[PDB]
């Protein structure tokens, strides 16, 4: 037997977040290496795992790792990064930084991946994951003409790569803010909860990339907030037994006469509903507040969206008989008595969500300088832009914010100059909405950090550094 061979293989097969870390520390032990020690650790790992079950992955990884851009991992060799949040994008950012050769510390306030909700995928993201060795880390990946990963399956897959490329990950730790460098001869340090491990508290860094999801407002940035008429969104996951007759029900994605025939037997009033068949029978529907008060899923009509959706106002029981009512008729009962999958809490996976307010940051980047040290702050993903989930551009643009944040760190580690690096980034960010698979570079395969492999007719000078004068924060 060969502990190293065995540990790598359960590590790859791992379906629990606490088991990715477990088997990995074991592989590190077996290969006489450490985790969170960068590419020198990655290089020591791969060389000693020169065997059938691993070699195709190193080719894939190194092929990317040696794309013209990363300078064979020498570009950001003098850059210390802090990445906040281990959602899909944050991890993608870490991967990108790891490859650029930056020191990568990722902090994350949870301790597991418990979200089942299925995410639609763009042709280009599908391929990106494939090139990162998704097919080894995940069996049922974009399986068939299917183009959807589940949140946790994505996170697991990405985490395994983050670890391989030597990202230092700390769990159960909350980013709160920043410690200003107290003197002429210090650097920027984070502010973490609950009390972080010795080194992490003293870990200094010039690049902070926060991918801490929609709800986190990072100090200094201005968030624009558009509100329209209310849209309540229900999501539901039912267990996929994958029985022959259970896997013979087509996927779905008020206009058609179906949304009309839904009111007949069930009396459920929905404008649109979506079905995905993944690890779970995924359903997402947009409900009318008019009928949610009627069939008593919401207890009482509160005029302010936020309050109308609290744990108190939402009846959990009726939400299940509402969700299964829509799900049962939607498949014409071809899936039988559907049982919910659980959280997170043993609670059944069903949630009433908000679709009313779309948060967008005014700038995607900000630089802070105090007593000599420069700090580059970048947003990536949901905290940069809040996506209309029915359209499904979240993973697409998060991954884009990630690529365009890594390009920023590249120019940064060339000393390009605060006002400039921002102007490049902000010229690219001005595109982040327009972006569709329709208006972007056709050769998906050729996609890389160089933003012009992605954006046709790109203008790096759409914003002059004189238009961003106050995104640079000279505190003295
Ligand atoms: C039900 C649902 C359906 C969706 N539909 C689609 C779809 O069909 N297609 C599509 O492409 N996208 C879809 N979206 C959007 C997509 O899920 C998100 O945009 C995506 O998760 C973005 O990843 P993220 O890392 O930016 O955000 P998140 O996944 O929310 O990552 C944030 C993470 O950072 C952590 N965090 C927050 N604050 C701190 C802190 N202070 N310190 C440390 N960690 C912190 C949290 O633990 C969290 O894990 C959907 C989303 C949901 C929820
Ligand atoms: Cl987990």
UniProtKB/Swiss-Prot annotation:
Region (Monooxygenase domain): 1-476
Tissue expression summary: Expressed in the postnatal and adult hippocampus; found in dentate gyrus, the polymorphic layer, cornu ammonis (CA) 1-3 and in mossy fibers of the striatum lucidum. In adult hippocampus strongly expressed in CA3 pyramidial neurons.
Sites bearing Phosphothreonine, chain numbering: 464
Binding site for FAD: 89, 108-110, 115-117, 175, 282, 382
Domain notes: The C-terminal coiled coil part contains the plexin-interacting region. The bivalent Mical/EHBP Rab binding (bMERB) domain, mediates binding to predominantly Rab8, Rab10, Rab13 and Rab15 (in their GTP-bound forms).
Quaternary structure and interacting proteins, as annotated: Associates with the SH3 domain of NEDD9. Interacts with VIM and PLXNA3. Interacts with RAB1B, RAB8A, RAB10, RAB13 and RAB15 (in their GTP-bound forms); binding to RAB1B is of low affinity compared to other Rab proteins; at least in case of RAB8A and RAB10 can bind 2 molecules of the Rab proteins simultaneously. Interacts with STK38 and STK38L. Interacts with GRAF1/ARHGAP26, GRAF2/ARHGAP10, RAB8A, RAB8B and RAB10; may bind simultaneously to GRAFs and Rabs and connects GRAFs to Rabs. Does not interact with RAB1 and RAB11A.
Family stated for the protein in its record: Belongs to the Mical family.
Function field: Monooxygenase that promotes depolymerization of F-actin by mediating oxidation of specific methionine residues on actin to form methionine-sulfoxide, resulting in actin filament disassembly and preventing repolymerization. In the absence of actin, it also functions as a NADPH oxidase producing H(2)O(2). Acts as a cytoskeletal regulator that connects NEDD9 to intermediate filaments. Also acts as a negative regulator of apoptosis via its interaction with STK38 and STK38L; acts by antagonizing STK38 and STK38L activation by MST1/STK4.
UniProt-recorded name of the protein: [F-actin]-monooxygenase MICAL1
Species lineage: Eukaryota, Metazoa, Chordata, Craniata, Vertebrata
Range of the intact protein held here: 7 to 487 of 1048
